[PDB]
Prior knowledge:
Chain B: This is Lambda-1 protein. The structure is cut from a larger assembly and holds two copies of chain A. Chain A has 1094 residues and is α+β, with helices and mostly antiparallel strands.
Amino acid sequence: PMSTRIAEATSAIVSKVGLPPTASSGNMTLTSSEIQRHITEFISSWQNHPIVQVSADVENRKTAQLLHADTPRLVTWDAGLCTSFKIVPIVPAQVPQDVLAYTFFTSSYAIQSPFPEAAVSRIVVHTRWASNVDFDRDSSVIMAPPTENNIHLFKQLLNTETLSVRGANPLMFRANVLHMLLEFVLDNLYLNRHTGFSQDHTPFTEGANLRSLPGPDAEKWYSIMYPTRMGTPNVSKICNFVASCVRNRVGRFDRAQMMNGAMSEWVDVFETSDALTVSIRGRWMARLARMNINPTEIEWALTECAQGYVTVTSPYAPSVNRLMPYRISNAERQISQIIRVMNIGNNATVIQPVLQDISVLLQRISPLQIDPTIISNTMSTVSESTTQTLSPASSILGKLRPSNSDFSSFRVALAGWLYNGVVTTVIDDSSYPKDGGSVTSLENLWDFFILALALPLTTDPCAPVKAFMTLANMMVGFETIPMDNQIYTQSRRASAFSTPHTWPRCFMNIQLISPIDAPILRQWAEIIHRYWPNPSQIRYGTPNVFGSANLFTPPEVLLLPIDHQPANVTTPTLDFTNELTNWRARVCELMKNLVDNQRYQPGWTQSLVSSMRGTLGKLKLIKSMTPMYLQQLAPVELAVIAPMLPFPPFQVPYVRLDRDRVPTMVGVTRQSRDTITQPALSLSTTNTTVGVPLALDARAITVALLSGKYPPDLVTNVWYADAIYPMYADTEVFSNLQRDVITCEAVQTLVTLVAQISETQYPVDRYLDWIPSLRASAATAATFAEWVNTSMKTAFDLSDMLLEPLLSGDPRMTQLAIQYQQYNGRTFNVIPEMPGSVIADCVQLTAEVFNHEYNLFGIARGDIIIGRVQSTHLWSPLAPPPDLVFDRDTPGVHIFGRDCRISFGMNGAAPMIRDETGMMVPFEGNWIFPLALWQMNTRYFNQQFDAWIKTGELRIRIEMGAYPYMLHYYDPRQYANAWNLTSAWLEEITPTSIPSVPFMVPISSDHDISSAPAVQYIISTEYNDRSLFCTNSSSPQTIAGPDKHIPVERYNILTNPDAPPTQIQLPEVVDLYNVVTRYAYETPPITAVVMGVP
Amino acid sequence: VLLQRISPLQIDPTIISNTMSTVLSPASSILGKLRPSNSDFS
């Protein structure tokens, strides 16, 4: 096809290293090879262009992220009831039973119940099971009922080698649980929404205002939301619990009606909820409310940013309580700037598109335009004789045409002022003469003019020495100066003097250059010393709202290589009082004095000297407005553009010829070394240099300086007010700030979570130490960090990359700091302070609550005991009697774990296993085993212990610390044996996985029953029946089996009239019913409130 | 061969390429010299 044909042709036409050369590697017609050689020369000349060498048509994977970063979704609304724990019925209740009537139950009357009536009902975890959000976070935590297994939620992160459907490695339980809690917190990040109310017409409540959930089938939620609304006709447990509550806490009880005929700003409602998620959403709301701004401050920020050229208006009336979360702090801005600088290091192909975009913006906003016809006219009006064999006017006109005809090397040069910390715009090699030079040659003389007039625009800290070295390179043999050493002689290429250490002493101490032997070089040195441009500042930006992400410099301040003198008039016109015109005039005068030298004038003819003098005079008296623009209009445009920009200015101080404050290196850090534990000491040796050199063409810059004029009839304020308005309306400045906030929160939560499984230097409080964990290493930390990053991206829905620059290294011990060092060894550093992080705080809070309510998540703290217990009693295995539990502090108990040997018993002797104390004991008694001991010797232990556990007198307490459990409910009236399950578990134990522990639990029944023998083997040690909610709720009593009424300790604000409504005893128990605030704020776009007055 | 089979250390040259996030420059000459594509580390 045509695409590949074009590609092949282009490759064939176009396509045809640093190492020293080695000896190993008249009548001209027209010929194919003769054409080919010209084609090769042409294509090589094109390829050796500095702009072409770095130009690209499509952006790479990181320039797009740097320029157009995906905006995250901060504000989201939940319209349903906020909770995470639901009540599920495990076993159905016997509604038709012998000793009762079927009319006793309320279930026979189709009466709605806030709690599911059943023989046994437990409580599980289900994030957003009654929620009606608009944007759905893919993160979620779903727990199956404990009768069904849940092992698939604990084998996600690092269980890639289990080779079992129901197995999981115990050592990664902490790593999986931390990720589970992180997913819980990330899912429960929503703002409660006010939806609507309706006063009930029924006498159940005292005319309270109920709340209506959206959706078509909302009939069901009116019973779940208000437990104390149903009738109480029965002595059942549900009605007994309901009748003991307080009647006057249902629905709305506090509103804020700021405006008539408008939605209430916020309301407070009594409804079924979850204390943990209510607290989490309250913290999230507080974090967002700390970030709010109003239209008045938005107007002030926009006006100060625009410098008053374009106006802004804001309304003056009562508000509607809108959300503008855009304001952020300064530490977050500095951290984001550090990360942005870090991800761009020594590339030179990622920062160039930013410079191109800024140059395009400058070209679109600026009133100056480049017009090279002024030079053509002023050189056509030159007086010279025809008989001469070379003409300075034609020579300079031919030389002053840029290669590849591009003039984009001047706006980019201006845009490079904003970034001198990372980009050092230098003059390309091809601009310098091919081999030194010679003042006897007019073409080289013009090249020197171009180079000397174009050098001051660059940001290279070595242009002052490079210009002098260019002139010295030209004037060799004709005129000599003392150099430093034998390597950097007077003949060394001027482009090779880019290091401050290479500055010759004759350039500093001009007394070395003898005036009677090198007057021209002496004069050039004095001119460079006295007339180089002076730096200044512009004071851009608005720190009130946008912050100030400008480090190494005081806030709201931008530096400029050339000085700024503002203009007191709005109708400018040509004048020559400024550094650029002075520089041009002094260069022309120096050339004239060089021509008038008594050692040089006799070499030239009479007419050519006059022609050169006239050309120099016209060049010095040319009418160019570029110096005036650069002096007094360019800083204004730069300060206008700088604030709203996808990459804020990153600058280092400028120094004029003083090579004692020249910044040699600048570097960032991400990690710390060894035991240093202190950035102020780490940063000196744990940093990587950041920066690139960029090449430009001097001819284009010289043309731009020499030729540029304003429109014939312009007024500056009107022109800028026309050109600036469209830009200000776009307002993408606001979006970035949000991404910076989430980036800072992400890095802080990353370090906080890594501190849980690894050893770090930050002070971190840990709660999950009782859950077993492995010896974490760099690979484990990296994998955990990658999982955290993936979760925190799939939440907030970001397709770009975040925390990759920090995770490229070792994520165990991280830090953010920066450093730049002067030539004289002085070092300045910036170590931003770590701000707060609501996400990390909520994760820590969730871990704290999990420490007390692990049973809610299916984890059972403790360890199991294996031993035959044959009895007809009805106690539950998760609440065993104390007389069966033994531990290390019990007399007559053998403890194993260090080393194990089995001595087979011959001639009827009994086999013995060596206790770690040294003694050996038979296969009977009370033992203690670490889990790893059985895991490492599964097959050997099962063969020699099951035959004694099942029937003998062997009891083993396997120490775990944490384990998931699975429940089996049997019928007390009939026989039941658990040996099959208790042996399947032991068989399926593997050196790298253990299946869920099975627990055989009876079923409670109100009517008395006849019991049957029950044999069970595995029991727990400490209490684990916390997920149990109620037994025989529909029935009014429970006689046989484990029982408990509805937990009073949960519904505190109903069973305790004295307690205030807004109390949470959260770190121990969960209220499951508490007051929750419903907001009705609205979030409009900026331009819908803040206008611009075109 | 036996030591390679036993040793838990596995070698992937992608670490160097990821660390030197490039898109002659010194950051590219070194990456072209260490040749992070050959998997023969005998």
